Each structure stands twice: as C-alpha cells, then as structure tokens.
C-alpha cells in the first residue's frame, strides 16, 4: 500500500543493485540503489566462491570400492562446505545494511528519526539537492541545523 | 519527506539450504557442478519482495 | 593483467544459431557486468544485453529480447553469447565488454578482440 | 538509436574542435554517458566515463562536459594519430536498455 523499509521486506522495485535507497521528497519517487557497497560487497562474494571451487579436486572392486568412497565423501564435503557460507554469506547481507544504516544515523543525526520499519521522516524538506547528499555521504549539518531545531518543536 | 534504505528483491524461484535453514529462496545463486546432486551456492540475498 | 579473449569468428546459414564466447583470462570478472555489443559493418554500436553472474543479473536489449541468450561460467570465467534465427543483418562484428562495476550504467572497459560472425546461404 | 552525433569531423593538426551529443530525458538526462574510441577492425578503448571523468591510459587533452539533455567533447591539439571514430554511449531507463550514438568519423587535415 504505502511503501516499505526493510524490517518486513525487501524491494522489488529496486534493481540497480542489492543494497540500497528510496527517498519520497515532493519531487517524486525512484528507487537508487547504493553502488557503494553493493560493490565491495559482490567482490567478497566473488571471492568466497573461487575460495570454495579451489577445493574441487586435489582387488577387482577394492579399487571401486575405493572410487566410490571418495565419490562419497567430497560429495557431501562439499555439501558441508555449501551450507556453511552460504549461512554466512546471508550474515554479511544483514550486516552490511545495518551497517547502510549507521550510514547515516552518523548522519542524518537528529533531522529525521526513525521511524521504526526503517525509514525516516525529515524536520526538513529534503529536495533531490539534499538526498543526493546522503548518497554522496556528502550531507553536512550545518546544513539547517536551526530551521530542524525548530521543526523539532512537532 | 522520507528516505528509506532497501535490498534487493525480485521474482526469482531458486532456492538453497543452508546450515540453519531449508529451501530459501534468494534472488541470485550459481550452481557449481558443471553426486548426491544439491550444492546450489548463494550469491544474492534472501527473497523476500515487498508486496504490491 | 585481466583481457577478454573471443572465440574465432564464425559462419552459419541463416535461420541456424551461433554461440559465442568470451574468456576472462589473467583473472576473473565474475563480480563485473559484462555486455554484448554489436557492430555490423561500418555501422553504430548497438547493445545486445548484458550479465552480472555473481549479482544475479542479466539484461537484454528490446530489439534482440526473446531471441538472444546471455550466459556466464563462473567456474572457467568465460561469458557466453548466442543468437537465434539468424538472417542477413544478423552479419557482424561482435564484441564482449567489462563494465566499470556489477552494472551496465559503468563504462566498458576491457574489450575483446571482437568475432565477425557471418550469416551467408 | 537514443542518442545523437554529427556524422563526421574534421580538424586541422593543433586545433581544437569539438563533438556534441544530444539525448532526450530518457537517457542522458538523468544517467550518465560514456563515450568509446574506434579504430578500424579494432575493439574500442573507454575514454571518459561518469560525464566528465577521465581513464588513466588517456590524455588530458581529451576532456568533457554534458548539460541538461546533451553532452559535448572537444579534442585539443588535435594530432594525427587521433584519427578514429568515438561513440557517445548511454543507459536508457525507459530502454532499461544501454544506448549509442550514430557514430563520428573524424579526419585530420591530410
């Protein structure tokens, strides 16, 4: 109905990349997804997995026997070794999107405050001037420190 | 006016097991055997797309 | 000392279909979006699509939607790229290309040799 | 094809002549454009990304602007082993397509 905000639900919508943001100033909606980490995040991702390719390789029915024991143990070896990061790849996914909210609550500071879903409602008017800002990781504060001082006041 | 901070979701139907779990769906994973046949490994994130 | 290496040019008959592909070697770049462009003889670039393996996307041009196929290998590093139903304008030069990051907005900047594939009776 | 070139340039050695490229609001307006190098029977070479950003291997004499719904670059000095053709490239997001122009040929005054 309304939109959303990560505690019950990830975008559809958003497409530019895994993580990211969405804004709704007067202008308008539009889904922009953080290259930043999206980034650095994939190239660990693409890490682990060569990581974890490398280990793929090193009487009649002795040797069989032999062949099927090993055909045995690398086989769930490896299923082991898919349920382990894959556990731990989707700890990395949560971690760095709290940590794309420490963001900017080392940011956003006392502007807008959360409104608890993950979302925050300006004391501001934030156009795309100020938006792109946060993206940047420019966003300053003093800024309008005043004017949201004031705003406070709700 | 408000901003908010998301992840990736989309209409994708893969799944994959992980140690605490079964059969989650995620959006993006690669399947490395080019035996027992399950090792699909997870790239993308957990699916769970918003609703409308 | 990443470069991408085609395989050799190509010539089939049309309404046939014709696979290419394009190997990352030096290194791999799986956690890069790479693209298929098309140059047909002394003409413009025109996008064909694109694959980011390790993001999970991947992407096609409107014009060659439904007819081409894009794939990636992340084990051999190679990204693939086959057409259908060709005809004589499929006739061309065809280029794989890195993108600056996992997505097409980035500049290409790796380019491979290029594969003139061919579509004669 | 999305985006627009002046079909061929010509400059003498030395001089500094400029390309332009227009789009509409579905591309360039709000995305960025990368322009490509080609010489002939060759792959192209990235020569600025991020509108106005410029690659290692490139000369500062290459260098570029875009505004509001089109982009330009100008070549100083220009020398004869510039003698190629560049392409203006962008992302369309009505597209959600990748775009280029129709191409420029340059020519340095024989």
């Known amino acids: 109905g309304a939109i959303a905000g990560f505690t019950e639900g990830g975008w559809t919508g958003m497409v530019d990349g895994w993580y990211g943001y969405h804004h709704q100033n007067e202008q308008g909606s539009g889904y922009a997804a953080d290259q930043k980490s999206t980034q650095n995040a994939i190239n660990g991702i693409t890490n682990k997995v060569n990581s974890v390719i490398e280990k793929m390789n090193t009487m009649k029915q002795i040797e069989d026997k032999i062949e099927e024991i090993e055909s045995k143990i690398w086989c769930y070896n490896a299923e082991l070794l898919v349920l382990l990061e894959n556990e731990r790849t989707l700890d990395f996914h949560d971690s760095n999107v709290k940590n794309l909210y420490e963001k900017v609550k080392s940011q956003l500071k006392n502007n807008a405050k959360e409104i608890g879903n993950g979302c925050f409602e300006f004391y501001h008017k934030c156009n795309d001037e100020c938006m792109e800002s946060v993206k940047n990781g420019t966003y300053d504060y003093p800024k309008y420190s005043e004017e949201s001082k004031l705003n406070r006041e709700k | 006016d408000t901003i908010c901070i998301g992840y990736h979701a989309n209409n994708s139907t893969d799944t994959v097991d992980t140690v605490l779990e079964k059969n989650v769906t995620v959006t993006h994973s690669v399947n490395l055997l080019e035996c027992s046949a399950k090792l699909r490994m997870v790239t993308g994130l957990r699916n769970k797309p918003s609703k409308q | 000392q990443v470069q991408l290496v085609q395989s050799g040019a190509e010539v089939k008959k049309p309404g046939s279909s014709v696979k290419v592909s394009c190997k990352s070697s030096g290194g791999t770049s799986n956690n890069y979006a790479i693209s298929w462009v098309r140059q047909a003889p002394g003409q413009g670039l025109d996008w064909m699509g694109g694959?980011?393996?390790?993001?999970?996307?991947?992407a096609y041009a409107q014009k060659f939607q439904g007819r081409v196929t894009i794939s990636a290998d992340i084990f051999s590093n190679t990204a693939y790229m086959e057409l259908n139903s060709l005809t004589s304008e499929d006739t061309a030069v065809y280029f794989c290309?890195?993108?600056?990051?996992?997505?097409?907005?980035?500049?290409?900047?790796?380019w491979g040799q290029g594969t003139t594939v061919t579509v004669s009776s | 094809s999305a985006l627009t070139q002046p079909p061929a340039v010509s400059g003498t050695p030395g001089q500094r002549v400029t390309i332009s490229c227009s789009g509409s609001?579905?591309?360039?307006?709000?995305?960025?454009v990368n322009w490509y190098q080609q010489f002939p029977g060759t792959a192209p070479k990235l020569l600025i990304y991020?509108?106005?950003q410029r690659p290692s291997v490139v000369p500062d004499r290459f260098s570029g602007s875009k505004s509001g719904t089109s982009a330009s670059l100008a070549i100083s000095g220009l020398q004869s082993e510039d003698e190629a053709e560049y392409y203006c490239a962008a992302w369309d997001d009505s597209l959600k397509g990748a775009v280029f122009g129709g191409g420029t040929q340059l020519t340095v005054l024989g």
């Open positions: 290309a890195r993108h600056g990051n996992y997505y097409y907005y980035s500049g290409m900047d790796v």
């Open positions: 694959i980011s393996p390790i993001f999970g996307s991947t």
């Open positions: 609001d579905s591309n360039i307006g709000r995305r960025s």
């Open positions: 991020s509108n106005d």
